[PDB]
């Protein structure tokens, strides 16, 4: 019935997310939380889906492709079809979402992005929550998170401490779309 689409992203002080096709940092504890948030489901036997762009797919080491215990959906007009049954190449955002709402064993769609994928999620009726990791500093990024109006959301007020790995500081933020709260 209810099918949420959540956004999860780590942005720096200028909203940057990507550099030279990869991520501008490596935060193992932050990424373990990413893996847990995008994998764990309320209903066991049900799965979560991750929707991503081709460049996010190419940024994952092939030994970790596809992302374990999740149904992978890759948006691309150029990619050949993936024979792996846990991966589907979707030619459009609308067809990807329609396919995911068709499969009943999917509990939550996690938009793991690429700027355009995040942008389409921000305009989706299924938009539910944004899980933003705000990293301190300017990491000289060449790809940025979409310009989002935070006034559309309610910021969750749970206590959020500062984190640090490898001399990199960051804090967690959670937002809920205002029509859902
Ligand atoms: N820090 C973070 O939390 C975070 C989050 C995600 C990614 N990143 C960084 O962001 C960068 C990549 O993100 P990106 O935005 O540059 O590229 P991307 O969006 O990850 O992938 C772009 C590709 O996705 C496909 N695509 C996107 N929208 C589509 C649509 N509506 N219909 C069909 N195909 C579509 C196209 O593939 P074709 O070109 O094959 O058509 C496009 O070239 C990387 O550097 C990555 O490390 C970081
Ligand atoms: N909060 C957040 N952090 C990120 O690093 C992030 N990265 C992307 C895109 N880039 C990547 C890069 C690597 C992996 C990856 O290898 N994930 C594995 C390993 C997690 C772990 O280290 O335990 C996974 O199982 O989730 C995923 C996304 C999208 N949203 C994000 N969101
Ligand atoms: Na497939
Ligand atoms: Na679309
Ligand atoms: Na802009």
Numbering used by the authors: 3 to 183
The authors write:
Dihydrofolate reductase (DHFR) is a ubiquitous enzyme that catalyzes the conversion of dihydrofolate (DHF) to tetrahydrofolate, a key step in synthesizing pyrimidines such as thymidylate. As the pyrimidine thymidylate is required for DNA synthesis, DHFR is a well-known drug target in cancer, bacterial and protozoal infections, and inflammatory diseases. Dihydrofolate reductase (DHFR) is an established target in the treatment of cancer, bacterial, and protozoal infections and may be a potential target for drugs targeting parasitic worm infections, including filariasis. Recent studies have shown that known antifolate compounds, including methotrexate, inhibit the activity of W. bancrofti DHFR (WbDHFR).
